[PDB]
Design an enzyme around this catalytic site. Sequence first.
Site, PDB file in Angstrom:
ATOM      1  N   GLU A 214       0.801  -1.226   0.000  1.00  0.00           N
ATOM      2  CA  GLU A 214       0.000   0.000   0.000  1.00  0.00           C
ATOM      3  C   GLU A 214       0.829   1.270   0.000  1.00  0.00           C
ATOM      4  OE1 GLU A 214      -2.989  -0.093  -0.548  1.00  0.00           O
ATOM      5  OE2 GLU A 214      -4.007  -1.765   0.433  1.00  0.00           O
ATOM      6  N   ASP A 223      -6.547   5.423  -6.066  1.00  0.00           N
ATOM      7  CA  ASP A 223      -5.889   4.149  -6.288  1.00  0.00           C
ATOM      8  C   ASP A 223      -6.036   3.743  -7.759  1.00  0.00           C
ATOM      9  OD1 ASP A 223      -8.572   3.539  -6.358  1.00  0.00           O
ATOM     10  OD2 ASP A 223      -8.598   2.469  -4.454  1.00  0.00           O
ATOM     11  N   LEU A 235      -9.372   3.222   2.167  1.00  0.00           N
ATOM     12  CA  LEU A 235     -10.424   3.651   1.257  1.00  0.00           C
ATOM     13  C   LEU A 235     -11.420   4.532   1.995  1.00  0.00           C
ATOM     14  CD1 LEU A 235     -11.689   3.367  -1.569  1.00  0.00           C
ATOM     15  CD2 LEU A 235     -12.909   1.367  -0.758  1.00  0.00           C
ATOM     16  N   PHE A 307      -8.269  -6.940   2.696  1.00  0.00           N
ATOM     17  CA  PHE A 307      -7.947  -5.553   2.976  1.00  0.00           C
ATOM     18  C   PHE A 307      -8.092  -4.686   1.729  1.00  0.00           C
ATOM     19  CE2 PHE A 307      -5.549  -2.683   5.751  1.00  0.00           C
ATOM     20  CZ  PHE A 307      -5.158  -1.722   4.839  1.00  0.00           C
ATOM     21  N   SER A 320     -11.517 -20.111  -6.269  1.00  0.00           N
ATOM     22  CA  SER A 320     -10.203 -19.990  -5.628  1.00  0.00           C
ATOM     23  C   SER A 320     -10.288 -20.283  -4.137  1.00  0.00           C
ATOM     24  CB  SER A 320      -9.633 -18.592  -5.850  1.00  0.00           C
ATOM     25  OG  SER A 320      -9.414 -18.361  -7.232  1.00  0.00           O
ATOM     26  N   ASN A 335      -5.562 -20.042 -10.885  1.00  0.00           N
ATOM     27  CA  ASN A 335      -6.917 -19.536 -11.037  1.00  0.00           C
ATOM     28  C   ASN A 335      -6.998 -18.080 -10.646  1.00  0.00           C
ATOM     29  OD1 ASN A 335     -10.178 -19.845  -9.839  1.00  0.00           O
ATOM     30  ND2 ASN A 335      -9.558 -20.445 -11.927  1.00  0.00           N
TER      31      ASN A 335
END
Length: 438
Positions: A214, A223, A235, A307, A320, A335
């Site tokens: 990040e 972003d 966010l 996150f 997945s 995948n």
Amino acid sequence: KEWQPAVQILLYSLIFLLSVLGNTLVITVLIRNKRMRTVTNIFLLSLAVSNLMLCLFCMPFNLIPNLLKDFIFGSAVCKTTTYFMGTSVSVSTWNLVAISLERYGAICKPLQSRVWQTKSHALKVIAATWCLSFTIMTPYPIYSNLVPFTKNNNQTANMCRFLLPNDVMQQSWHTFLLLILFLIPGIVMMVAYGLISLELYQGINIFEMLRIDEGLRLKIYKDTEGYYTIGIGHLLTKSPSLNAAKSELDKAIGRNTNGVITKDEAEKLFNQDVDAAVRGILRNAKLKPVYDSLDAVRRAALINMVFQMGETGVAGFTNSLRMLQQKRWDEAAVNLAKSRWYNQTPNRAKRVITTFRTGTWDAYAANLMAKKRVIRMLIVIVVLFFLCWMPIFSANAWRAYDTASAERRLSGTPISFILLLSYTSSCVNPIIYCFMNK
Ligand SMILES: CN1C(=O)[C@@H](NC(=O)c2cc3ccccc3[nH]2)N=C(c2ccccc2)c2ccccc21
């Protein structure tokens, strides 16, 4: 006899060249590049100055008299050469201690040891080291004198010698040096490099992992998705309005921030984020089963994903999520890279996927690998320092306690080479720096 002077001239003159060339190089490189002047290197710059001082103000006035067996320079040179030799060892030993203490601050108390990392403090410590080292060493110029003796054909010579009023004082002084040049610096740096080493072993975790993925932006930004974000990937709102992000910002930090937060509010925010991601994993009935089946490194990959995209967006990684739970790491890794998420943030996704595939931190280890490298260099420098300086300090201490034994075992070539070993320490660190960018 016949060879001993040759090997002496050879080794002494070689060790002089390396030490002069080596240390002035280290200095001129550091004086050149402002980019190089980190806190740790400002010390290694004070260390390279003492190595140059020892090399130019002591070594000739030791080989030449020991080669001639007659100290032919003045009584002043005799006080000078002994003064700078003990000043140097003191500056160096306490420079090495300062280094261990700053790397301890950086590695073990990063967001807690803020002042130990200012260059202004660094030049305060360096100044206090040189000033105190000249002070505690003033016995050497005060009590060092030419001591006349007589040679083969009744030929008068002088040797430069450091003599305190009696034997109790000579022995007290060596206890002194034992303490403030080995014992006290030794344990300080062994506790420090020991704690540093513990930390560096425990390695990467979710927080360091998310810090690499990040970053830190103190000011509001957008972003890859174009969403308004702050701090360590926090966010703010999906809405396109900037007024609404600025509002959701002030509400989260509690103050009218005006688009800008501190690093300390980002970390508090970031800690709540990792908390919230992990709670979302535990409360979601699709994610929690997978999580419990995961090992701690993979747990952190699942948290990393949650996150970035939220509880619900990740919980929809149904195919997945299944493969992970079934421990089919290669399948999951293949995948997950066909997903839109991969396509949007490849570099980060490739790392998180590596974490899922291998169960290791290889994807995030680069920086840790650099810190470990530096630390191992520093521990090597400290150990070569003590090994180069113990012999001569132990020979002087033995002389003050049992001079007749000490002189009969060491007087000829042994103290010649023991002295040589001392000067060798001043050409050790530049050679180490050379072999470090291999
Ligand atoms: C005067 N002086 C010595 O006496 C030397 N000790 C010897 O030379 C020595 C010890 C010994 C034991 C047994 C037999 C024969 C021995 N000789 N010690 C260092 C020094 C070391 C550390 C701090 C200060 C000074 C020194 C360094 C440069 C010049 C003069 C100087």
